Amino acid sequence: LHKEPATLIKAIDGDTVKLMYKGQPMTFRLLLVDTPEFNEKYGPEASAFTKKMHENAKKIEVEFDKGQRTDKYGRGLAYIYADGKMVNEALVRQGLAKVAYVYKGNNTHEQLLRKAEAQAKKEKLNIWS
Ligand SMILES: Cc1cn([C@H]2C[C@H](OP(=O)(O)O)[C@@H](COP(=O)(O)O)O2)c(=O)[nH]c1=O
Ligand SMILES: [Ca+2]
């Protein structure tokens, strides 16, 4: 896998964000995670976390996996990095997303994320409290 450039257009929620990628506006859905909807418990906290991590970043990068690059809703499916830190992982490590939606052929970082989830759960953070 490889990282490619993008720039923030707008935060959306815990696990979706509007980025400019190859010069086009796209909504990205973070691979391998599920944040609560804004209206659900920890949803505002997830949305805030993702917004801050993107907005504070000097450099945003997207990393597609090996399989499908867009979902059925036209959303890009990627791992997103903010100054080299993976947002998807960081959310899970903080107990603000569950590992989820692990489809065969786009699951390169599954084990990394499951390790983060286990540590979040051990710490009883957020969702796991
Ligand atoms: C993360 C992810 C979601 N999806 C689809 C599955 C779910 O379909 P359904 O809408 O039919 O439930 C939906 C979940 O996204 P959200 O968690 O953003 O709602 O997005 C994919 O197809 N591939 C993916 O990698
Ligand atoms: Ca969600």
Check: CB of residue 7 under 8 Å from CB of residue 19. yes
Torsion sign (Cα): 89, 90, 93, 98: negative
- Of ligand 1's listed atoms, the one at least distance from the Cα of 33 is 1
3 state DSSP class of 104:
coil
- If one counts the domains in the chain, the total is 1
- Per the structure, the complete domain to which residue 71 belongs is given by 1-129
Check: CB of residue 75 under 8 Å from CB of residue 89. no
Rounded to the nearest angstrom, the gap between the alpha carbon of residue 51 and the centroid of all alpha carbons in its chain is 11
3 state DSSP class of 103:
coil
CATH of the domain at 108: 2.40.50.90
CA of 5 to the centre of ligand 2 (A): 24
Q: Which residues pair with 8 in a beta bridge?
A: 19
Ligand 1 binding residues, C-beta < 6 A: 29, 31, 34, 71-72, 77, 101, 103
Structure determination method: X-ray
18, 50, 66, 72: which to mutate for ligand 1, most atoms within 8 A of CB? Answer: 72
Q: What is the CA radius of gyration of the chain?
A: 14
